[PDB]
Structures are given as structure tokens and as C-alpha cells.
Design a protein around this nucleic acid. Sequence first.
DNA 1: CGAGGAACTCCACTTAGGATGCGTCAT
DNA 2: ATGACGCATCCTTGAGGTGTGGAGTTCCTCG
Lengths: 289, 433, 1116, 26, 91
Amino acid sequence: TRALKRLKVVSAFLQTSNSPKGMVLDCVPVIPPDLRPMVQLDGGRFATSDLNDLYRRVINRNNRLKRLLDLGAPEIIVNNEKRMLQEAVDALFDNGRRGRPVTGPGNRPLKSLSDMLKGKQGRFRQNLLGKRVDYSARSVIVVGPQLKLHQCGLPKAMALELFKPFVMKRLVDLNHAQNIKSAKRMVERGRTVVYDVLEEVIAEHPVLLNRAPTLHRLGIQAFEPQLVEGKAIQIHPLVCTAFNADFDGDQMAVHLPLSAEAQAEARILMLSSNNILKPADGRPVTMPT
Amino acid sequence: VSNAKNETIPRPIKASFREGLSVLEYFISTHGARKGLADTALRTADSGYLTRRLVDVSQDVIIREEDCGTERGLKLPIATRDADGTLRKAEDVETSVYARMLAEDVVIDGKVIAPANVDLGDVLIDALVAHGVEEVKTRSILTCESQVGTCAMCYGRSLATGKLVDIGEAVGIIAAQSIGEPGTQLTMRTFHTGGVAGDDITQGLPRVVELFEARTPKGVAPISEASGRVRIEETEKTKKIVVTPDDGSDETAFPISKRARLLVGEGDHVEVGQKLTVGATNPHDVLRILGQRAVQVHLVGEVQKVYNSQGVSIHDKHIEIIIRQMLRRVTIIESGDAELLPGELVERTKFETENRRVVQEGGHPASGRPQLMGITKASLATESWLSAASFQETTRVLTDAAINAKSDSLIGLKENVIIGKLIPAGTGLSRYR
Amino acid sequence: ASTAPLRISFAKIKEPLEVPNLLALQTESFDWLLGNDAWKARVESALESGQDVPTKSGLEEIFEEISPIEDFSGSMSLTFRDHRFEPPKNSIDECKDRDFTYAAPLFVTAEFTNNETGEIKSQTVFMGDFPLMTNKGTFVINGTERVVVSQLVRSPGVYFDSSIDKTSDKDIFSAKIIPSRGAWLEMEIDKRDMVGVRIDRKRKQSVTVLLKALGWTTEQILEEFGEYESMRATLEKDHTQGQDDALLDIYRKLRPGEPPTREAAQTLLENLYFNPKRYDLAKVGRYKVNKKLGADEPLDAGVLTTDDVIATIKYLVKLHAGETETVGESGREIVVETDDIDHFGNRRIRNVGELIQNQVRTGLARMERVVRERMTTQDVEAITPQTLINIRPVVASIKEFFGTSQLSQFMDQNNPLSGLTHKRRLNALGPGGLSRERAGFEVRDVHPSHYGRMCPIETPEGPNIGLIGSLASYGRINPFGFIETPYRKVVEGQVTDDVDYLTADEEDRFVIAQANAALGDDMRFAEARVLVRRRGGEVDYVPGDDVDYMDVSPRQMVSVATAMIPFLEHDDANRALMGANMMRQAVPLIKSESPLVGTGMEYRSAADAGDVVKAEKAGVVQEVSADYITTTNDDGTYITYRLAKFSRSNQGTSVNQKVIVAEGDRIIEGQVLADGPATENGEMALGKNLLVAFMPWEGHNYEDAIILSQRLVQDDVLSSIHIEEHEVDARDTKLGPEEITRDIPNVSEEVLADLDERGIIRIGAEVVAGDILVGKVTPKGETELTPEERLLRAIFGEKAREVRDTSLKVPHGEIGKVIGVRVFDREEGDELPPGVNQLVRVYVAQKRKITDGDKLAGRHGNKGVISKINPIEDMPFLEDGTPVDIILNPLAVPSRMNPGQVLEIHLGWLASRGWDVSGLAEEWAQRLQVIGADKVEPGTNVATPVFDGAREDELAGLLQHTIPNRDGERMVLPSGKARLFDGRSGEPFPEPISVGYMYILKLHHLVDDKLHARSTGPYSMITQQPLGGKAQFGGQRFGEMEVWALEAYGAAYALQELLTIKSDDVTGRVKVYEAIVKGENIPEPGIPESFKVLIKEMQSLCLNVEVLSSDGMSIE
Amino acid sequence: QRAAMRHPGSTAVPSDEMPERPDDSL
Amino acid sequence: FDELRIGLATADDIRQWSHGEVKKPETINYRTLKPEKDGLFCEKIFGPTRDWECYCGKYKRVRFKGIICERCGVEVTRAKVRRERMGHIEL
DNA sequence: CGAGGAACTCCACTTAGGATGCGTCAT
DNA sequence: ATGACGCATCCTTGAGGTGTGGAGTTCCTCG
Ligand SMILES: [Mg+2]
Ligand SMILES: [Zn+2]
Ligand SMILES: [Zn+2]
């Protein structure tokens, strides 16, 4: 067993064009500053990243040791400085792996290059799978039993600002706006024609309603928005078993697609007038209850 | 309602919430409410973690081929329980056989009853059970063979459509989510001791966690090795059961603690496959002795036990997707001839192909033995290090990939959502593109 | 002070002890700390009454501890002495409105002395500006209020645990000793019969090795403990002998690679374990240890002794042996048995004063260190106490605590009850306590030791269930830190009048009776079977003569912010919990009014709080004017009670006060001369009374929703007023000093028409989104002065304005009208850090009416959100024409398991149309008559105790015998229901309906603030993604589960569309918007930026990651 | 002491640097 | 963009990666709020924080695109180039 | 090489800033 | 005056904090 494991590492060193000469480091690179920058916080404060401090200290130790050995000091101090440089690089690459992790202002440990990647709050499971998006509103849900199964009610403010670009297209097309900045001005000021165009644009626009804990596939669906008054989003009363969206004051998120291809997919596969069937055991889900 | 520390109240609340309640009964009641609230709060994220594991495993199991053409298939009991000799339907046909299409042309009296390549609905089933059958053979994933993964007809029809599964359906995520969603709804714990402990296996979500991760059951019972004469050789320091399997087979002996609830008699006869004492049997052991079908049946039955005893109903296609993706690798013995190190837990495909190649060159092949691991181990045992890096163990898998100098092609949904390019599934398959 | 609005009482049982003070939990502790005259009066009262109080002030002990500091020789010495206080330089309102803090200087009479000189240089030096509290109980800091909560952390001492090892299948035991300041001790037994000791969290060591390190050796080990076999086996395991050898080996193992010497080991052990300067064993810790181990009366503030260690050894080895009772070391009969964790006999309550004391102690120790350094350095007989002492560490410690800690936290000023409960949280979180994840599920659960000291119902709804909470109504903090509980004593089968105070352990030593147990004419309990309580949640009855104690008040286990619910015995635990949590975020209302149905914890809970102004002087009022109520006392002095007229609270609500009396009235001490917000006549007023009809109605109330009537949009019955703030200020900068002026560069005259010459809008003019609050500008700027532009400007010959508008900006999405303005400058004595030139604080105040989507609720958690608003006639009407105000879905009442609102509705109707029971001769009539609440006029608010409220048959009979509208018009049928007509069509609904009156709150979960959407706004820097946050025009968290959903559905293009173009890049973000505004086909997706930073960070770790293609480098 | 306490604006705060820094690029 | 492969690296590989070095152990000036030479956040080694501009006085004009300053050793490049350039310490 | 068995490494993860050493080089 | 320089004051010492839980594994010290 001790033979084979060692022998697989040796096997990894057999064919690979690598060289373990680099397995012991004569240098250390540094990340660019914009990925670990400092900022001028109010009151003369400078909020700095911890990796900045770690690089600062290791550079300090490097300079001190190089200047000490520039003249040939006795070997005990030189060896102590060498081991301190080794320990500083060890803390840099992983502060918590070996020894007491190096702290900063408070007692909390700093963060190394092998902590900004791993873990839940690193990069993988925090920034690449799910990226917070534009054109993504949210508001409170209220039941309305005056809707077709493919319908939802949306307040006029979220509708004004979400569909603001399509609204602007139509005001410019209708020649109400002589220029685009005038279109901005009438969007901000608000007119009767603005709400008329908003009621016009909400038509033929599937809208992806969504809830937070998407436990199953039938948790995000499409609807057709109708410009209801008030300040709450309005929902059909037999899709509240798919979303599990009951009215204890809950809140619902709403998204919008941008590509017409996305619109076709959302009106074909997503639209809740076709997805009557649950995906688990076949039975219909959107039925009277 | 359960008393403090999951005990039993030695006095009930003798009234409802309308007649009238004093205060100490309200105090007693709020115990369980607080406990259940905490269970919901934590089980949200715990079930989230479990579905993360099952999504990592069951990704890239998307259908690509339309047909394979096999005649080999799963043998399913279609109508049991002939107590009065009457051939009548079975209770769990809807989740076991239904929507699993047919392969042959089953004949009972010289006439085809159920034609070939037709959906197995209900009218055909009533006709068959009236005819007198108690069995059927179906195309399935657990026996499908293909050069590009899985074909369509072996699966059946997508339950959410009723129409046949479109070629390219991302069945994997559907299976993962299907299994994960009712996890929040299980919440069935041992609220009362009842004077039993240890033997009571982990119940609910932990059981699925353990069985999909191939860990030994807590009260794992020993598994029979070979049939023959069994007896007791217990010692005061260690209880011990010894069986001499007949037909020139070596004795097998297993030590057990004092409390065992042994279901095997003294000087009795055991079968090659059967349990020995109370407790779930390790899937590895039933893989060792009873090939493949027994272990698939065991896994499916054990997961369906919890799911259909809680109250939620799920068709077993998803479970069988999970099991086919799990039972994948083969350990190698007598590996000198095939020019590879013994062990290493290699896959079935490359193992068979390379043994075939060596036999073509002349060298005799190296013996193999299948083995099943857990979902986590299989996921991190990937061939594309990026997915395993994203899943867990980032630094470790990173140094594995750094030493071994391996490379990953664009195979993989998760590898493709990380990079941000059209995933090949559902609609992004190049055939439609 | 019986000067409250009448609330006719439906109660049936009196109480011995009424509700004591509600905020003693802050004021008494701080009085102990600073030790003012109130402290001395309370101390004398406790002494003459023989109560448990801290005899000496916190600061006196803290200055005594660090007083006698000397050098290595004792030549020069410094010593502090008694304490004195000087009145503040400011007033509370002055501090609040001038950014100051409630500070008061502290004085000590320090002394310097030389032993050989014999001269004592007495002096007085100010000990910085200590902060004080208000009369309320809060702490004013840095222009805001704050509260220091009580804490709940495990007490110090010893803890015996009996755990199970799984692989060995064995019963291991562990004695963990948690001292106060020093290092912990671990002592493990029964792993292999080898008792061992772990110290500093390192590999465990055989006990006898350390037993030799102290004055014990093998000989007396044989002599004394030669009876328990495990210790003998450990002695067999022993290898070395001799105390010096023991010290050698321990210093070797704990400190490897260093010379092991007698001095080093002796110093280390004595400093870590036997030095009262690094190991200050707590007074509570010492007391608990003494009572636990029988160590009778050692030095109360000492350090551990070897006697203590051998006592722990005895306890552990007997626990292994299973011995029941033993003779305590220097003590008497004690028990041997392992201990639990979460029983309140093991958790201690750190009050406010102890917290401030701890931080001041750290500061004093630091100051001592600096002083010791300097005096060791300083020349002798040339130094004074005012010369070597720098108290900068102490001030730094004070500021650190009151600015940085996570126990000094904001007030909640939505209403009086929010604050009232906020000052009673027994927060077990914080530094040195527990944590969400590490702490398991035993802490997060209730305990039989919660029977009047921690509300089992009241708790946050989330991760923190069981970590935080609220003190019981009848609570009083122990000096050591605990919760006492009041009880009424039962003796020889009868009960005495006097009250007793009992804590968790002595509670466990008693048998506890029940509150609403019926009391007979003879004081002894009548029925032979009395339903009492026993230890550890053991429910059982007793014949009666053996009962020991009994419950003073049936609203005890419930806190003060949950005892107000009517009919709390007709719900489920979860719904009462939800009501308790969601009855404390109710906005105040303009025409605040007391409920028609409630309980007697509105008057007490509105008076014992702060916002209500009260007259502390018997006399006659002269004037009640707009603002200043001017009164003349019997003693003959003029007092000007100023009132908080439309002032702001923390979150941005309104604390508007109002008059209650006229200008010809007599007043006694402690009478409510006014009312605060959400209060009428000195009673808490959260919501309003509305008429309800229980029906499914067109589905507009499907699944627990609410539909309202436009009456409450005309009457303004349910409307509130908020007060936003803006605190802007100019800075000196480097490009000239920023001024606050009307002269904003190049703006129209209409936008600054409201603005003043100095640059603030008129005090009273309206403000809406898109306006300007304060005009600010930087005088100079290096905007564009490149040589090309410089030459262009020179050719033009006109000097452009380098100024830039740094003006304040009212947020987009708010309307309001100005309530007030305040201006400050460095010219005045105001306190401001550097650079800041001029400070402006403009408060804006808006009025909001109820609107669809605004969350509402009730007192039984019957939550819901407004669905639609309809005219007055659309909703039904009864037989005499009166419409119905609210309508609820009757499907939620059974399922949600709260049948405690129907009775509230019926009693509300009964009150709103007064009844008349003048001699019905029925049993219930006789009971309600001897109570005296029989005749009631139409409007007299009814009071129902939380656990002694209105019963059923009484309610039915009252509904049967209400006053007729006309000759014989008893309106609703005798069984609750009512022949409600149908406003829509006109025909009566097929069968009767149930209608009444219910009290509805207006929770702070507004609908305008919730509404939120984004098109293009601010991003993050390290990752080019849209901001994550509600208040900053953020996006949404399309996490991983939604990506799984879009994969399962097979929608590929949409998932890509909203995972690369919609965000996380630059080209896609700009191009989607651009192509939209110019109208072309949507462009192609791209590469995430998160991926780029990922590969860059991977590169920085030397992992040679690179992207290779079939040909090498392909298109990126 | 004179290297740090002189203009001691250098604060290594991670919890209030990534959310509190706006982006100039629109 | 077809395959992703990883391995290890040496000094030649890192100097291929990077542009310069760093020896001054501290951040930019706290007096004039300007960068320094051979330190962290140095415009010489990391990208210029101000776009179409350099450190001293000579290439602040817009018509300079990507060229190198003669004294402060800063290529007049993107602000986002401060996200891509890299450096190293040589122990 | 064959024992116990205890470390090591993964995974579940929610406000304002306690100075000097003193002297002085230089701006 | 700061943030730099150029040294360079005879009795000598930290500080607190560290309360899960899960199985993987691999070395490492003792049969
Ligand atoms: Mg809800
Ligand atoms: Zn097939
Ligand atoms: Zn330059």
C-alpha cells in the first residue's frame, strides 16, 4: 500500500511534462490590486483588503532579510528571519491551515488566497452559478379571482420602471417624444398616455413569476401581466399550489426575459396554461382546491 | 403530544382549543411547536444540501439517443395477490410499471394482447390481468445498453406531459428535484422513545442521505454469503454466528453484540441471499452475493419505503436513474496481464474495452468485480475536475488536478453554466441548433 | 394613580401582587453602578427588609482592585480612592439635538507616595466623562438612544458530563472546569479506567503526574484514596515520582524545546492557576463551586486550590462508582451526579452595570500598565499623580464598548411596547456566549425552568428560536445574574399573603401550584384534587395539604408584550407566538384610540413606558396651551411641561404627544397630563375597531386575505404618519471649503424657490420625489484642464464654473412635508470631527392612508394582506342598514387552528352596541351581576383577562339580551349569526352570517417600501454584478435552485440570457440597454466576469491553469 | 507608533469594502 | 475554449505571467493620495488607475494611447488593465 | 507489517480606532 | 509638524480566547 500510493504519485511524475522543481518556491506572485483594492471611506478612513496587508508584511520581511544578508550577519538571526519568511508565506497562502491564523485590527482572522475560493461564500457557490440580475422586481402578493389562468396583476410603478424601455420605444414611435431624453422626462413625470402605453406594452409579454425556495420544477412559471392598480402583485388563485405561495404576507419575485427566443420558450414550455401536470407523479397540480 | 426531550406526556390535554385550556397545558404544547419550527428552519437548508449532492451526481444523465433496440428488460410483477385465485390489479402499479413502455408482444393464448412499442396505460393492463398474466417485461434504463448514454424508449413518457419523452429531455435534474422537494415534507421523527433504541434505524431524510451515499446503515445487519447449515458459537465476551455453506463451500462467521434480534435459527439452513438479523443490509454485501438485480430492487424498495410511507408519491424512474448512475465502477484483480495497477476502482466501460483490446493483442483479460460508492464520492470521482471543484473539496481536488495534470473538455452542464455557454439539453442540443 | 379611561372588567379572579415596575431592570443596576442617592435609599430599604442587593458600587470595587500599584521595590507607589460626580454640561434634549452625548465627569482623590520619603501627595484628577442613563432606562449616545440588554451565558465553575463512546460502546465521563478569567481544565475518566487531565486544550495527561506536581505524592495516595480501583490502576500506570520530576515533565510537554527548570514550571503554574491577578475567579463562580463541592466559606474572591482539584477528582471517581451521597470536602451531605447544560441554574444574567464594569476594568488595567511603565522609568520625588497618569486607555475602552459592541443596540420606537419589550431581551448571543451553528438543539428548546422568567411563547421566528426572547412580566435580576420569580406561599394547606422570590434551583426544589385554581371562601383550596406542578415538567395533582407554593398571576409565563392578547387560551402555540411577534411592529395612528375589547395591560404598558408625560406634583393646572402645559403646585411653584409635538423616532415614525386635561383641573402626583404616540387617555392604542363579517366573498379573500371598506379611507380611522430624516453636512475638502448656499450653479428658479438663502427649503413646504432638500457646492474643482481644453478655453475667453453640486437629494420614492430644520456650524461649541464645515438636519413628515397591499394583522396572528378596496354599498349591510367594515375568509379559522378570534369578534360587537342585563335571574346572569359588569352603555370598552377572559354561555346570553335598536329590535340572532343582506344584488344571502367587531393593527410591513424593481443601477467593484440590496435599487437573487429549475424545464436560452447578458459582465449589460434604446435584434451572450476573476485568483496560487482548445488558443 | 497612528486611515475592514464601494462604469 | 488543463509553474513561468516586481512594503501616499514606485498599487507595475493618464505630468492628454511614459514607467492603458497586470516578490 | 487511535482535513455556515523617545533633519 | 532621519535613557516577564457534529484517513506509536 505504501508502495502503490507513493508509486501513483511517481506515476503522476512519470508521463507528465511537469517538473517538481517548482514544488519548492523561489518566488511568490501577487494578485492585481483591483481584485483586492482599498477605498477612501469617509473621515479620512482607508478600507483595505486583508490580502493587501498579507502581501505588505511578506514584502517587509523579504526586504529586511535581503538587507540583513547583504552584509553577512551571524547565522542565527539569518536563520530566524528565513524561518519567519517561510511562516509568513505559509500564512499568506493559507492563514488557518498551519498555526494560529494571523489576525488584523480585531480578533477575527484575516483571509488568505485559499479562503476567498473555497467554502460556501467563496467564488464557486457564491458568484458563478447565480449572478444577481437586472429587470428583476419583487413585491407583495394578493389574490385576484378575476384573471384567466395565464394572467397576473402588476402595480403601475414596477410596471413603469421594468418595462420602461419598451414604454420608451412606443412613446418615441408614437412621436410623443421628439428625442430620447424627452422620453426619459415623460417617463419620470408621468402622463395619462404613459399609463396607456404601459397597458399596451404589458400585452404579449410573458413574465416569469418566481418564489424564493424553488423546491421543484413547477416553482418558476410564466404569466401575462395586466396593469392592476394598487401597490401589490396579483396572482391567479389556482397557481398557489405550484409556487406554494400562500397569503400570510408573503412576497414574490418577478423576472423578465429579453430575447424573443426566450419569449417563445416562456410562452411554450413555461406558460402555466400548459404545465397543468406536476413533473413528479403525473397528476395535475393546477386544479381547484 | 411529545413531552420534553422527546418523551411522552404522562397526562393528555383533556380539552380542545374552543372549550378552554389552562396555562400549563399551553406550556406543554408549545414544546413540540418550537421543536417543529426549528426542524423546518434547519431542514430547509439540509434538504437544499442533499439536492445539491443529487444534482451534482445526476447531471449529464440527459437522454441523447432515440432508440437502442434491446430485448433484455426489467421483469415486473403486474398483478399479485391471488388470494381467491382472482387475477386483479396490484396497488402500486402506478409508480412501478405505469408509463414504462413495452418491448415484446406478450401472448397467453396464441394471440398478441399487448402490442410492441406501446404505452402501458390502464386498459391494456386490465386486459392482461383478465387474461391471466402475473408478470411483464419492460424496456428500462437499468438494463439499457447504448453507445451514447441512454435512449428514449427505455425510459418511457415524461410524466409532466403524457406524451413520450422528447429526445434530449434533461431527466437528471428532474430526478434530483423530484427526490429533493418532498424532503422538507418528511419531518417524521421518533417523538417518543417507547423503550427502543439502536435498532430503530435513521428515519426520514437521514435514511435517504445514508442510502444514496452508500454508507453502512447504523444498525447494519450481516448478509448471508452462501446457503447451508448455520449455528451459534457465541461467547460471553462476543456473540458469534457461524455457518458452514454446503456443496464444498468455506465457512463464514460473523460476530454480533448481545442485543441482536436474530432472525436465523440454531442448526438451521440459510439461503445464499437472505438477511441474518434485524437491520438494513449493506448495499455492498448484496452486490457481492446477488449480482445486480437484487441490489437494484433493494435500493428502490428501501427508498420507496420512506417516500410512500410518509405520504408523497414519486415514480421510481428517478430512483432508478440515481441507482444506475451510482452502480458504475469496477475494481480490478489479477491486473498484471491488462497493464494497469490492481485496485484503482476503474469504470466498467474503459475496463471492458481495454480488456477486449488486450485480448485482441493476445493477453488474457484481468478479472473485475463491481462496486458501489456514495453520491459524493462518485461526484468527486469525476473525469472532469471542474465539476468536482465546484461541488466540494476545492483545494484538495485542485491539487489532485495540479499533480495529475488532467484536462476537462466541455462535457457537463455545470461546467457549461460556469463558463456561461449554451448548455446542451432541453433545447440547446446541437441537433435542434 | 387611578386616572385611566374606564374599561369594564370581565375578569373573575383578583391577584395578590399587582404588576411591579416594568423597567427596573436597567435603572436599578445603573444606580448600583454609579451609586447615586437612589442606590443608597434602595440599599437601606433592602437592609432593613433583609433583601439580596449588591452592597457596594461597581466603580468603587473597580477602583479598589487596581488601586495599590507599586514597582519592583515598592519605592514609589500610586493609589486611588473614593469617587465623586459633577452635574452634566448638557441636557438630554440638548444632547439629542446637538449631536452631543449624555456625559458627566468623574472625580477620584488619587495619591502618590514614597515609602522612604514618607510624603503623600494627595491630589484629585478627573476620571473622564462617564455616560449616564435617562429616567426611562435607555442610554443616550452620539445623538441617538441605545439599550444594553441583559445577557444569558453559562455560569462559571465545574460541569460534569456523562457521554457515550460509540466505537467502544462505553460510558465516558468528563469534568470540564470553566473558570472566570484563566484557562480551562478538562478531566476525563472511564475511557480506559485511566483518569487524565487536559490543560490549555492539548493532549491529555495522567492525573497522578500533576498530583505529584503539587504537594501530593504516592504515599498518601495509598493512604487515603486506596479504595477506588480506577485510581489504583492509574497509580500502576504511573512512571515518575517526585514533585520536581513532575514539574520537569509538565514543563517539557506544555513548553517543548525550552529549558525545563523549577522556576519556570513553578512560575507558570502559579501564574495560570494560583495568581489572583490573571485568574479572578468570579464571585458567582466561587459561590457556586463552594455550594457544589462543600467548600464551606473560603476566601470569597480567591483562586483555585489543590483542595478544589481533589474535590473534582472525588466527584468524578464517585460518579464512576455510582455513589449517591457523600460528605463534602470541608462540607456536609452533597449529591454525586452529572449535570445538564441549559437549566437556568447554570446560566447567568449579565446586567448593564456588570458589562460597563467589565469594559472599564479592561481600560483601568491598560492604564495601570502604562502608569507602571512610566513610574518605573520616572525619576523619584519629581512626579505627581497628575503627571504619571494618562487615562486615555479608560476613555478608549468606554468609547469602544458604547460604539462597537453587539450588546449596546438601537431602540425600537414604532410604539411604546416595542421599546418596553426591547429593554427586556435575555439575549444569549454575543461575545463569549453562544452561536447559531455551534450551539445545537438543546439550547434552542424550552425548559421546565421557564415558569415565569422567560416567555415560552415570545421568541424570534427564524434561526434564533430559543437564543433570544423577552423577560417574563414578573421578573427581577439577581445581583449575581439570574431571574427571580414571585410566588405566594402555601403553608399547612392554606396560603399566606406574603410574596416570595425564588430562582431556578430552589424552584426545582419546590412543588408548584396553579394560578387560576379556584379559591374557596375558606382560604384553603376547596377541591381535594388540586392540579399543581412538580420538578422537571412533571404534571401531577396533590391532596392539597402537601402543596408548597402557588402562582401569583396567570399572566406570568407570558411576557408584558403578549399578555395583551384577548382570548389566548383558544389558539395553538404557533399562533400565539406569531401574534406576540407581530403585535410589536404596528405603526401609530393619527386618531389613536383604545380598543373596544382588550386587557388591562394597555394602561400599565403605556404608563410604565416613557413617551407619556406625567405630572409628579399634586396641585392645580393653570394653563394647557398648544405646547407648554403650565402648572402651579400646592407648594406654589410654576412648572412648564413641554410636550413632544410631532417629533421623530428611530425608524421614522412619529412620537406626537397631546393634551388630555383642560385649564381648570386639579392634578395629583403621577397623573397622566398628556399622551404619547399610539396612546389615548394613557392606554396603549395600536390599532382600531372594525366590523367584520365571516364569509367567502367572490374569492377576493381566497387563502387568508382581507378586503376592506372605503369608510376607513374617509374617516382616516386606519392611517398613520411617518417622519423621515436627512443629516447632511459640508466638508472642507482639499478643493476649497464646501459651503451650504442657495447659489447652486446653473439651476432653475423653481427648484430653489422653496429653498432659503442659506440653502434649506421653507419649514413647512411640501416635498416629493424629485425635489432638492439642501443646496451644497464645492467652491473649486479640477474638472477639465488638459492643455488642449486649456487652449480652447483661452481662445473662447470665458471661464467656465469649476464648482460642482454636492447638494442633498430627497430619495426617489418618498413624499412628505417638513416637520423641522436644524442648522449647526463649527463656530458654536457643538462637537464635530474635522473637515466638516456646516451641518444640516432636515426632518420630513408624511401621512399615509390604508391602501391595498399594505399588510394588516390581528392579535391572534390571523395575518393577511389587503386584496381590493370597494365602495361602501358593495359590501353587505345588516337589517338596519349599517354596512360591514372588513370581511375575512372563514376557511382559515379551522385549518390555521386559531378559534380564539370568533369570541373576540362577538365581544367586540357586544361592546359596540351596549347590552343590558337588568335581572335575568339566570346563573350566568347572577355571576356577571356579582362581577358587576352587567349594565353597559353603547361604547364602554370591555377588558378581558388573557387567561380569565369572557366565557361562552355568557357571550351567547349577552348577544341574546342586547339593547333593542327600536321597540323590539334585538338585531342578531341568539347564536352569533346575523341575517346579513347582500349589498351586491339585494337578496339576503341564503342563510345567516356571523358578524361582529374586531381589533385590527396596521403593521410596519408597508407596501410602498416593499415595492422594488431595477432596470440599470449601481454595481459592485471586485465582481461587475448588480448590487445585492433592497435599499440600493438592487436586482434579485437568482441563486442555484432556480438554475436547476430552468435546466429541468429545458429552457436553455432563457437561463443563458439571465445568467450572462442580464448581469455579471460589461459588454452584455451595456449592449442589451443600447440595442433596446435603438431597437435592433438582441445581441449574442458572452463570458462571465466572475470566471475571469476565478482564473486570475487560480493563477495567483501558482496553479498553472490555462485555456486550451483543439488548436490551442481559440476565440475568447 | 509614528508609522501607524499618523494618518491612521489604513483599516483592514473586509465586511464594509465590497458592498460599500460603488462602480464608476455606469 | 475547448479544454481546461492545469499543472504547476516556475520562475520563468511567473515572469512570463507578470510585468514587474514589488519591494516597497506599503500602500499609496497618504499625503497627496497618489501612488508610489516599487510598492503595492504602483502604476509602474500595476495598471494606471486613471485612464488616458500617467503618474507624473507628461501623458495626461487623451491623444496618448497605450504608449510608455519615459520616467514613471507606466503604459497609458485602461483602468480595467489594473485588473489584469500582475507582479511578484522574489524571495 | 499488523494493532489502536488520536490528530488533520473536508463538509454542513447567519461602529470610531488605546503614540511616541525625544531631537531634529527638511519642507 | 510630519514622517522622516540617526541613534539607542543599569533592570528586567501575555492575553485574553478556546461549549457541534458528521464521518473519512493516514500516519504513528505500540502488539
Ligand atoms: Mg407565507
Ligand atoms: Zn434503451
Ligand atoms: Zn509619467
